[PDB]
Symmetry: C3
């Protein structure tokens, strides 16, 4: 079942990527960079999850699904780049703030991988450092990055706020599931965790970019 | 012989790098970025191939030898080659860094699928290989489609140079997956030594030859 | 002792990062990018050294403190980015020159890691390539990068020269200690090398950015 769930996930990622490609051909004032990011996220995630479907992107250590961290260390900084570019839509870019989010996010994913390879107190030290990074990402998202969005007008700021809440609600679920599942407290079964880390990322990747791209495209004049 | 071939390759990479450095000192309207890219490609490749010459950048796996240092080479040198190609198309005009990074992403993916295919067996190997070939097809579609249209937007003379470089690169690059499939990593029709020689000769043309053709052509556009 | 030294180091890195964050809130004409670089360097290094403190970022092979290379491959190109941005302060950026330093530096760290995994002549081939990369970094630092600093006026060039000497003096210590210690000739003891690679980087990361940011901030008035 776990293999078939990952094949299904990879197929959905491919369909999402093809949909964003089709949208990119009639871009409605959204820059090509947003369409590229929206395609790379699911194609990379799809490849990483295909490796799990094929029985390659996991090892016994309990099963470490290490291909999830290979996925996230690329897909999650790109999702924050997408969020930042939405805040900056129609205005000056702040690439310093964008790269601040990239740095926090790459660190967060690495601490999760090291936490997964760790045992005892050590595991929860790494986990806690990753949670601290996520807290700072959310502080930036609802603080300075939101102030940039507000500077780009009512309609853009409304859309940014929707995308920021959508992202934040889904992202807090990842460390929650991690802690409850086999990598942490071992309260939830492996299959439960697998389903959560199939369904969450469908919404976090393809769902996020449908919401984000549709909302930006709606701002288009003629 | 295999060790000596790799030492020889690394020496040729170093000579190429020194030549591009000397050209960079009298740049003839070509931006410093193009000279830097042209030097990083052969120096990185030369270091990776030095690791093979020293007996380090390879291991035994499925009874075959995986020359893993080739993938360490290509995952850096090949996206830089497409960046060089893209910057040629954009010469004298607005840069499209979105298209350039599209090529970088496709290319890094392509090299990673090759490495994973090499570590794989059976149907799994050809799934990864096939995904890398699809990435190369999309790179070539970009090269002869939208990237060529950018070159044409920069005028007849630039577009003539771009088209020459695009054909040169494309002709060499389609050889890599062809050799890979025929050789020990794939169907095992071609012998290890044949594959070693192909993956010594091809990259001399793909790296140093490409940047000689590209930089000479760009420098020729300069009026002194 | 080795574990406690690494915990202490990680704590000093955290305090440095928090100090640079506080400076960033009243930036005195220094761009946000400089404060971001100044924070990433010690936080990344702190995390890498925490892995050693916890007994994770090392293996027996001699002990390879592999977490040092994970640290340096990110922290050292960022330090050269900081140095390059200082030279370019108040003028046009030369990102080609900056990325030239990044490329040489990442290569240098990788040769050190490969040298550490190597034995005999092979070890010293990789080590020598890394030393050549460092010499080119220093030639750039005191040649073309210093000429950019001089183009940005007397006060900036005075500050740049101070931070270039500070960085250069510390950086030449790393390959010297590496060669003398267990990874090289094995003349210096493991504990001596551990202390050198605790003290040097405190000056190379937090000390460097205190000197750099204080000097740039002083140019505001
Ligand atoms: C294991 C994973 C490895 C990851 C692999 C990473 C690849 C590194 C290189 C990428 C392409 C570089 C892009 C080049 C940037 C564009 C240059 C540019 O903008 O040039 C401006 C102009 O030419 C000057 O005046
Ligand atoms: C091993 C960890 C590797 C992490 C690499 C980072 C992954 C890719 C994400 C990078 C951030 C992309 C930022 C794009 C900025 C676009 C700016 C613009 O559109 O003008
Ligand atoms: C990974 C480590 C991240 C540190 C990198 C440096 C930040 C570079 C930001 C570029 C600044 C451009 C100006 C701007 O839009 O803010
Ligand atoms: C691989 C690269 C990993 C990077 C290192 C991880 C730690 C980096 C975190 C730096 C983030 C701190 C910046 C927050 C302040 C920004 C603001 O004030 O808006
Ligand atoms: C400060 C922010 C840190 C928040 C993170 C929470 C860490 C969770 C604690 C881990 C549970 C330990 C359970 C156990 O060890 O048995
Ligand atoms: C070390 C990093 C510490 C601090 C990161 C601070 C993140 C940004 C907070 C700003 C809050 C706001 O302006 O609303
Ligand atoms: C820089 C280019 C990188 C080359 C990779 C070489 C890695 C060699 C590891 C040592 C192997 C061994 O000594 O057995
Ligand atoms: C590991 C595979 C993916 C790694 C690379 C991902 C690249 C995609 C992300 C960023 C695109 C950057 C676009 C820059 C836009 C600037 C404006 C322009 O000139 O078009
Ligand atoms: C491309 C997307 C990322 C891929 C992830 C890596 C897959 C795992 C590779 C190791 C498989 C080796 C094996 O066959 O056991
Ligand atoms: C065999 C290699 C396959 C691809 C060759 C490239 C085809 C390019 C056609 C698209 C060009 C265009 O968009 O006009
Ligand atoms: C011209 C193409 C050269 C390749 C032919 C040699 C094949 C040798 C072999 O089968 O190993
Ligand atoms: C964290 C951020 C960057 C630094 C991390 C590198 C150290 C990783 C070390 C992981 C080894 C764990 C193996 C073990 O538990 O034995
Ligand atoms: C192996 C991994 C290598 C990662 C290297 C990380 C740091 C790389 C480059 C830093 C680039 C900083 C650019 C600063 C722009 C300054 C500005 O415009 O304000
Ligand atoms: C080891 C691998 C390191 C890879 C380094 C890649 C270097 C190549 C490209 C950087 C080009 C930067 C161009 C900036 C142009 C603008 C300017 O000069 O200010
Ligand atoms: C230590 C050895 C190397 C340092 C060499 C510095 C030479 C600087 C050259 C300055 C110039 O090009 O004018
Ligand atoms: C200050 C204290 C001096 C201690 C000795 C200095 C290092 C010598 C090298 C060694 O013996 O390992
Ligand atoms: C441990 C404490 C950190 C040690 C770092 C300090 C190195 C030297 C810094 C001296 C410059 C500070 C004063 C100034 O430049 O204004
Ligand atoms: C002009 C560039 C061509 C891009 C085509 C690919 C974009 C769709 C997403 C990948 C799907 C792969 C299958 C081939 C199409
Ligand atoms: C053993 C093989 C491990 C996976 C190989 C692919 C690595 C993909 C890149 C990971 C870092 C971004
Ligand atoms: C066994 C194959 C390799 C497993 C380890 C891969 C590490 C990937 C980490 C990605 C960064 C978070
Ligand atoms: C033993 C099997 C139990 C499987 C339970 C898995 C529950 C999955 C729910 C995940 C939540 C997804 C969030 C989507 C938001 C829209
Ligand atoms: C799957 C996640 C949500 C998709 C629907 C979003 C619709 C946005 C408005 C058009
Ligand atoms: C390969 C040749 C590279 C030589 C680098 C010279 C140092 C920089 C001088 C400005
Ligand atoms: C081994 C991979 C890294 C190669 C780096 C290339 C360094 C080139 C330095 C060029 C400096 C130009 C000086 C202008 C004056
Ligand atoms: C032996 C494995 C270490 C080398 C990894 C090379 C990965 C290449 C990525 C394309
Ligand atoms: C064991 C025999 C299997 C042979 C499969 C070879 C086909 C690989 C895919 C080719 C894709 C186009 C190049
Ligand atoms: C003018 C239309 C461009 C089509 C290009 C033809 C395909 C190129 C093949 C390259 C492989 C060698
Ligand atoms: C874009 C260029 C791709 C070149 C791939 C090379 C094709 C090799 C020959 C075609 C596939 C033959 C499959 C035969 C399988 C027999 C078992
Ligand atoms: C050790 C470094 C921690 C913080 C240093 C602050 C120095 C302030 C100087 C004024
Ligand atoms: C993100 C980097 C954090 C490193 C500092 C945390 C370790 C402090 C050790 C003292 C107790
Ligand atoms: C046991 C032999 C030790 C040899 C040390 C070789 C390294 C010397 C210093 C580096 C010189 C590189 C060229 C400049
Ligand atoms: Na967006
Ligand atoms: Na070019
Ligand atoms: Na600086």
């Amino acid at each position: 079942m776990i293999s078939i769930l990952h094949y299904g996930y990879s197929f959905i990622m491919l369909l999402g990527a093809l949909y964003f490609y089709l949208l990119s051909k009639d871009p409605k004032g959204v820059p090509a960079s947003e369409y590229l990011i929206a395609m790379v996220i699911p194609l990379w995630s799809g490849a990483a999850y295909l490796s799990i479907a094929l029985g390659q992107g996991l090892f016994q250590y309990t099963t470490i699904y290490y291909a999830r961290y290979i996925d996230w260390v690329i897909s999650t900084p790109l999702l924050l780049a997408a969020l930042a570019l939405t805040a900056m839509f129609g205005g000056k870019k702040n690439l310093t703030l964008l790269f601040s989010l990239v740095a926090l996010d790459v660190f967060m994913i690495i601490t999760g991988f090291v936490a997964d390879l760790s045992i005892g107190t050590t595991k929860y030290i790494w986990y806690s450092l990753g949670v601290i990074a996520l807290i700072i990402i959310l502080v930036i998202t609802f603080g300075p990055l939101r102030r940039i969005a507000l500077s780009n007008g009512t309609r853009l700021a409304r859309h940014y706020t929707r995308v920021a809440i959508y992202l934040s609600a889904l992202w807090v679920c990842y460390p929650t599931a991690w802690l409850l599942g086999p990598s942490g407290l071992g309260l939830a079964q492996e299959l439960t965790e697998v389903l959560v880390f199939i369904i969450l990322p469908i919404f976090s990747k393809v769902g996020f970019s449908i919401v984000d791209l549709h909302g930006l495209r709606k701002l288009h004049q003629s």
